[PDB]
Structure 1
């Protein structure tokens, strides 16, 4: 399995789609988010990426932290 730190920008878009978060793939792509960034995103980054719903963002944050395992 490809490790997260090597995921490309399309790999990140595929990850979002796998979790039914494709609504954010355009913003993540336009902001050039790849796997070297993904597990290190903070609350303010996700707001800048258009993730605004409180519980929704906390869910994404949780999933992001899990990628560190």
Structure 2
């Protein structure tokens, strides 16, 4: 599998699907979110991408901690 920094936009869509965060795929793709963006996303970016529910941002924050060992 690819290092995260090399994830294309669809690779991020696949990852979101895998997290049962599929309803965010279109926003992440329409906003040009690739693997290089994931380490840099702030809460305000996740809000701008339509991730308005606390639980769903916490799911993304949790997943990224394990992906990027932060």
Tell me how far 1:26 sits from its aligned partner: 0.2
Preserved contact between residue 7 and residue 36 of structure 2 (Cα < 8 Å): yes
Structure 1: 5+ residue stretches without partners: none
Count of aligned positions: 69
Structure 2 length-normalised TM? 0.89
Q: Which runs of 4+ in 1 moved over 4 A?
A: none
Tell me how far 1:19 sits from its aligned partner: 1.0
Tell me how far 1:58 sits from its aligned partner: 1.4
Structure 1 length-normalised TM? 0.90
- Report what 2:62 is aligned to: 62
Preserved contact between residue 24 and residue 51 of structure 2 (Cα < 8 Å): yes
Distance in 2, Cα, partners of 1:58 & 1:26: 19
Deviations, residues 6-52 of structure 1 (Å, cap 9, x unaligned): 00001000001111111000000000000000122110000000001
Structure with more of its chain in helix, by fraction? 2
Q: Secondary structure at the match of 1:66?
A: helix
Preserved contact between residue 12 and residue 35 of structure 1 (Cα < 8 Å): yes
